[PDB]
Design a protein around this ligand. Structure first.
Ligand SMILES: C[C@@H](OP(=O)(O)OP(=O)(O)OP(=O)(O)OC[C@H]1O[C@@H](n2cnc3c(=O)[nH]c(N)nc32)[C@H](O)[C@@H]1O)c1ccccc1[N+](=O)[O-]
Ligand SMILES: C[C@@H](OP(=O)(O)OP(=O)(O)OP(=O)(O)OC[C@H]1O[C@@H](n2cnc3c(=O)[nH]c(N)nc32)[C@H](O)[C@@H]1O)c1ccccc1[N+](=O)[O-]
Ligand SMILES: [Mg+2]
Ligand SMILES: [Mg+2]
Lengths: 166, 166
């Protein structure tokens, strides 16, 4: 079967694990997921295609020096996740994207911008802000909540279709 | 607010109305929807943007001669719908797409390919077939079911993001 190697990426705290656990095990992690080389494998059917999702749920903080380069090399598509109540994690996206571009030696890698925790009242990054960063990268922007499951399958499935047209 | 003028298009029978009724009124129409200039208007929030969906649910059969040209001129994005248990409706998609291209005077119009009725056992058009037609057009392919609500918000929201990057 077609297999898709997806890497979830973003700053410490933004909900990388909670998005993945919500997709694979169907529940919201208020606990601390393992967050090193966490790999999840799932047979799914996406638009009628039977396919294997192999996702790497990555660590945030930049002790991940060139161990990023390793897992970025192998990844076909990347979810780039920030949290809508944290502008630093948004600012940081630019850094994750360049590092990906640097390692893939390409200006266009399958990639989705995901503004997570959209269930929270107190957002510090307006959708418009992120919408027009995505526009600026030429990639979809999707808002999610791992807590309510909103946008979750959207974000993951959109990325899989991004890889399909590549 | 940002408003998005969407036109649902496809051959007689494929589920154009049932997709729209499922999005707007949240239930599956086993009855005969009105199917002429059916317009639905809904305030929705898509990825954190408050926006107005104005959808034209169109008639299938080609008594719609140049009255197509009218509503195709004004449409920003099109859902192009076939039914996965009918190869003629699939074959027909090419005709809807050219007519759109002819009227918009453009090779790329915001557009999604939707293979509807994916809840049915007896499909005559494999996903791969359609996947690689979509690839051939450079547009997303999404499988739906108006009956089970599968893929419905996916299809409609993906098209709205298609228009956003235009
Ligand atoms: C060690 C490093 O961990 P990390 O791996 O960089 O952190 P993650 O990005 O994996 O983030 P995780 O999935 O662990 O979720 C973080 C917190 O935000 C909450 N959260 C995630 N998604 C949502 C959502 O949509 N809604 C709401 N309301 N909350 C959500 C979680 O329940 C959790 O308490 C990390 C770094 C800095 C701070 C935290 C942090 N951490 O793991 O706790
Ligand atoms: C007049 C013209 O009508 P039309 O407007 O071209 O037809 P539509 O494309 O709007 O199609 P509609 O939404 O009316 O649904 C058609 C039939 O398929 C069923 N259907 C739609 N979506 C699904 C789904 O996902 N699952 C299942 N199981 N069935 C689904 C409906 O319940 C209905 O019985 C038309 C033309 C030819 C044939 C029929 C036809 N018609 O309206 O009945
Ligand atoms: Mg984690
Ligand atoms: Mg109809």
């Amino acid at each position: 079967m077609t297999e898709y190697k997806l890497v979830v990426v973003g700053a410490g705290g933004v909900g990388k694990s909670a998005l993945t656990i919500q997709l694979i095990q169907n529940h919201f992690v208020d606990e601390y997921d393992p967050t090193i080389e966490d790999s999840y494998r799932k047979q799914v059917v996406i638009d009628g295609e039977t396919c294997l999702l192999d996702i790497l749920d990555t660590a945030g903080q930049e002790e991940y020096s060139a161990m990023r380069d390793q897992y970025m090399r192998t990844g076909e598509g990347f979810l780039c996740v920030f949290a809508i109540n944290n502008t630093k994690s948004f600012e940081d996206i630019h850094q994750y994207r360049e590092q990906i571009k640097r390692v893939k030696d390409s200006d266009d890698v399958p990639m989705v911008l995901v503004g997570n925790k959209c269930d929270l009242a107190a957002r510090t990054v307006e959708s418009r802000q992120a919408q027009d960063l995505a526009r600026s990268y030429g990639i979809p922007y999707i808002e999610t909540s791992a807590k309510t499951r909103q946008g979750v399958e959207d974000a993951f499935y959109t990325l899989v279709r991004e890889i399909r047209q590549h």
